[PDB]
Amino acid sequence: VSDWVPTGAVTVRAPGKVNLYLAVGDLRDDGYHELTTVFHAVSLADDVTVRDADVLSIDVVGQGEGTVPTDERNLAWQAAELFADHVGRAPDVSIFINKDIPVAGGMAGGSADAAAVLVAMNELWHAGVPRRDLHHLAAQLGSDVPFALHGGTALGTGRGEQLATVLARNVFHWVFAFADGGLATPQVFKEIDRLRENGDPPRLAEADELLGALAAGDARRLAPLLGNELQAAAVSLNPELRRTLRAGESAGALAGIVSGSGPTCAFLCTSADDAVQVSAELAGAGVCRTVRVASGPVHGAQVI
Ligand SMILES: Nc1ncnc2c1ncn2[C@@H]1O[C@H](COP(=O)(O)OP(=O)(O)OP(=O)(O)O)[C@@H](O)[C@H]1O
Ligand SMILES: Nc1ccn([C@@H]2O[C@H](COP(=O)(O)O)[C@@H](O)[C@H]2O)c(=O)n1
Ligand SMILES: [Cl-]
């Protein structure tokens, strides 16, 4: 009820994600890695207000306010052009991004932004583009965009774009530790390739047991099953992340893991109150930039 919702605008919330499970396979023909991941959408979201305008524009507040490009480099720019081309219209809209999702943090914030734009423009124009086509467009924009449309909890395969919804039969309570800087996703995938050239480090087991924990609604069962094969790459590049993980664990978290390609650390807690406690101890531990509490699963990109 603090969202920017001027008359004639359409405002869409799209959530950040954490990978509860991320197995990384072979580098494909197309230059991407085959993935098996369980995506999970959390209450740390971006809020995107789109309006008809005389030209395409982007403005950003919140996370990355100084920082995030507002020209063609922005994934929301690309999304606006793509959606407009799909519907046979010029991308004549102003896009305002109120960001809580960290920049370059492994929570797919730009992908949330791009997904929101698709949904917002469809509604703003009453363009009638069905969910399956919005999904195809999202897939063109990037691997994490379709999940940002989809929300909830989901098994991503292929590059991450092919989604099968899974049951997460509870509210799960999270603490996120935002890092001092960011990591470039391509560098983290390159780094896992490099770590596998050097040795044969351990791979995750099948997702079966983790999926069963999720379907049971059981955070304590789930915690030790969480895992992310990019975590070794992210900690290779940012060694300090081990201190962050150790601190959140020692603060009371059931489990900590790097989210995605990092450097955000995610901490699964047993209750809301437990996360209150863990987040406080962690902010005073001197190990990360800033801390958040969040819950999941939440809905995918949705008109507010
Ligand atoms: N709307 C946006 N929000 C944040 N970063 C953006 C956006 N558009 C383009 N970027 C650029 O993309 C990179 C960061 O993207 P993002 O913040 O989505 O990383 P991420 O959240 O780690 O992505 P993923 O976890 O899906 O790989 C930076 O190079 C940044 O300049
Ligand atoms: N499945 C995936 C997803 C992303 N990536 C790496 O991350 C980069 C960004 O991918 P997206 O644009 O799909 O987010 C790719 O160019 C690639 O280097 C990958 O190598 N395998
Ligand atoms: Cl979908």
Residue 32 in contact with ligand 2 by CB distance below 6 A: yes
CA of 134 to the centre of ligand 2 (A): 20
Q: Nearest ligand to the C-alpha of residue 131?
A: 3
Closest by CA to 64, choosing from 178, 142, 186, is 178
Residue with the smallest CA separation from ligand 2 atom 11 is 142
Distance CA 64, CA 60 (A): 7
State how far the Cα of 246 lies from the Cα of 263, in Å rounded to an integer.
Answer: 14
Dihedral pair phi/psi, residue 73, rounded to 5°: -65, -20
Domain boundary among 125, 150, 167: 167
Whether 13 and 160 share a structural domain: yes
Q: Which of 9, 85, 11 is nearest to 53 (CA)?
A: 9
Query: Which residue in the list 17, 46, 100, 274 is annotated as catalytic?
Result: 17
**103 and 183, same structural domain?**
no
Catalytic residue among 100, 144, 193, 273: 144
Using DSSP's 3-state secondary structure scheme, residue 260 falls into: coil
Which residue's CA is the closest to the ligand 1 atom numbered 14? 104
**Catalytic site residue 190?**
no
State the pairing for strand pair 57-62/33-52: unpaired
Tell me, in Å, the resolution of the deposited structure.
2.0
Residue 297, CB half-sphere, CA atoms under 13 Å: how many? 24
186: which DSSP letter?
A: H
Q: Is 160 in the pocket of ligand 1 (CB under 6 A)?
A: no
Residue 57 tokens read as 């524009």
CA 28, 199, 29 angle in degrees (round to 5)? 5
How was this entry determined? X-ray
CATH number of the domain where residue 142 is located: 3.30.230.10
Alpha-carbon gap, residue 117 to 124, rounded angstroms: 10
- Please check whether residues 4 and 145 belong to one and the same domain: yes
CA of 186 to the centre of ligand 2 (A): 6
Supply the Cα-derived Rg of the chain in whole angstroms. Answer: 19
Alpha carbon nearest to ligand 1 atom 7, residue = 110
Ligand 2 pocket, residue 125 CB under 6 Å: no
Q: Is 162 helix (H, G, I), strand (E, B) or coil?
A: strand
74 lines ligand 1 (CB under 6 A): yes
Q: Do residue 232 and residue 253 come from a single domain?
A: yes
Q: Which one, of 294, 10, 13, 16, lies nearest residue 147 by Cα? A: 16
**Which DSSP letter does residue 223 get?**
G
Q: What is the CATH number of the domain that holds 284?
A: 3.30.70.890
What ligand 1 atom has the least distance to the C-alpha of 75? Answer: 8
Q: Which residues are CB-neighbours of 189 under 8 A, at least 6 positions away? A: 24, 33, 230, 233, 261
**Is 144 among the catalytic positions?**
yes
Structural domains in the chain (count): 2
Mark which of 167, 190, 206 sits at the end of a domain.
167
Per the structure, the complete domain to which residue 40 belongs is given by 1-167
265-269 and 172-178 beta bridge pairing: antiparallel
Q: Which residues, other chains included, contact 145 with Cβ-Cβ below 8 Å and sequence gap of 6+?
A: 75, 79, 111, 114, 115, 138, 139, 161
- What's the number of CA atoms in the CB half-sphere (13 Å) around residue 46? 35
Which of 167, 199, 216 delimits the end of a domain?
Answer: 167
